[PDB]
Amino acid sequence: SHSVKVYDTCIGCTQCVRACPCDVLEMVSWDGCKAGQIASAPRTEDCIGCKRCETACPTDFLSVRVYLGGETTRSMGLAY
Template sequence: MWMAKKGRVEIYAEACKSCRFCIEVCPKKVLETTSAVNSKGYQYAVPVNPDDCIGCAMCATICPDAAITVYREA
């Protein structure tokens, strides 16, 4: 039986500088920026569609600030 891949994205908000690279690269449109700001004054990425994450980790790979961790789940 084929099972869809599942992932879980965690964003370290304090490290995010709102470059939006992660948002643009995500094939499932899991991430978006929030209207809240971190202590540096940047809006940061948050998972808005977390159940759609496939665990590809493209967001974590492209993040220049290492602010994203992706966990793959069964």
């Protein structure tokens, strides 16, 4: 599966979670930013690797990062 990391530069804008087509990311409680929330990736086995979350991230260099790894049926987006 692909690996998705969220670094502590996250401002909790929830844009990466809204951009995710595969429901990989979610918002959890945090105290490191003014929004009081940070992104997390509990479901990276469903990650296709499209990097729409990285496109959605507004922080100078990204807070959410996708590292493409081992390809599975889900990560390759195969309907067969």
